[PDB]
Amino acid sequence: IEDHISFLEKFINDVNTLTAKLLKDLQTEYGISAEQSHVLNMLSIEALTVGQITEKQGVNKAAVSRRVKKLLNAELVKLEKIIKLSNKGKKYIKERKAIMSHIASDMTSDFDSKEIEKVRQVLEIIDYRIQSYTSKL
Amino acid sequence: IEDHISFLEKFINDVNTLTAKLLKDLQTEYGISAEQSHVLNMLSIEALTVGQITEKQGVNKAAVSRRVKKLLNAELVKLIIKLSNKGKKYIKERKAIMSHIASDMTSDFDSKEIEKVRQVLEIIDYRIQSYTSKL
Ligand SMILES: O=C(N[C@@H](CO)[C@@H](O)c1ccc([N+](=O)[O-])cc1)C(Cl)Cl
Ligand SMILES: O=C(N[C@@H](CO)[C@@H](O)c1ccc([N+](=O)[O-])cc1)C(Cl)Cl
Numbered sequence: 001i002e003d004h005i006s007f008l009e010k011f012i013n014d015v016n017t018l019t020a021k022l023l024k025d026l027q028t029e030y031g032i033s034a035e036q037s038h039v040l041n042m043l044s045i046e047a048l049t050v051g052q053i054t055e056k057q058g059v060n061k062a063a064v065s066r067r068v069k070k071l072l073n074a075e076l077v078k079l080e081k082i083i084k085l086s087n088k089g090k091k092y093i094k095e096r097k098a099i100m101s102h103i104a105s106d107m108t109s110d111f112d113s114k115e116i117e118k119v120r121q122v123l124e125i126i127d128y129r130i131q132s133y134t135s136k137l
Numbered sequence: 138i139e140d141h142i143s144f145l146e147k148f149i150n151d152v153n154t155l156t157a158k159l160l161k162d163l164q165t166e167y168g169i170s171a172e173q174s175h176v177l178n179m180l181s182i183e184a185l186t187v188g189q190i191t192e193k194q195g196v197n198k199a200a201v202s203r204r205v206k207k208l209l210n211a212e213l214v215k216l217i218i219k220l221s222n223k224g225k226k227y228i229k230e231r232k233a234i235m236s237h238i239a240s241d242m243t244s245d246f247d248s249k250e251i252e253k254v255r256q257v258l259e260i261i262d263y264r265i266q267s268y269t270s271k272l
Pocket of ligand 1: 065066
């Protein structure tokens, strides 16, 4: 009830702890820092400004800047202007989705796509609401 | 199933987005960065010796090392490293914000619906941890 908030916090912590570990090598192979990939996956969504990324993240603006340039030095992301992803950066995101999808299947081998449908409908609606709140200050 | 993973990925991204904005003013008011707040947030649960404090985040040796102490000074942390009273009070405040907003956002839902939501995230989390542990 405010216990769901905690669970949700724990659930997220776990996904990060897992995704981190699952993506270690690939990040090494790319030269990437964890916080850098999360920017790449953050842009995997479209294109954002360095303030947007800092404001959607909540870390020191300088740090976001230090990671945004390193991605342009590595040709992982390009510019419009705004900051898009480069193809090099895409094959990455693509190599990520592939590792994610392999494990997600194990853990969801025995589910009911109908069970899942309703649950997702409830989330898209919560997601919709979270976004509206965010825009207003 | 890739679209299911994209959504969860996005879903999370917003939650994180939103929590940041919603706590910014209060974290600034306590003089701490967001990153110092999960450090407290992880301790809202337990108390931890550096290793495990990093065992969840999994980032740098220095990132952990130069935020841990800051907090003792701000006086919201103790060493082990457990919460301090001022720290305990911060969380109380943090939980307020989060709960009112989450409530007033789920309010029109049939507990039955939300419950099946949590039950499917629990099964999913149960498998993650188990899998995590298998490294
Ligand atoms: O933006 C920053 N520094 C610039 C200028 O030196 C950048 O060159 C930089 C790159 C890498 C690192 N290093 O710590 O990973 C620091 C700074 C600040 Cl984090 Cl010091
Ligand atoms: O890896 C993270 N990065 C984001 C979360 O929004 C970043 O803004 C951030 C990192 C660490 C902490 N701190 O509380 O541990 C807060 C925020 C998690 Cl906290 Cl989700």
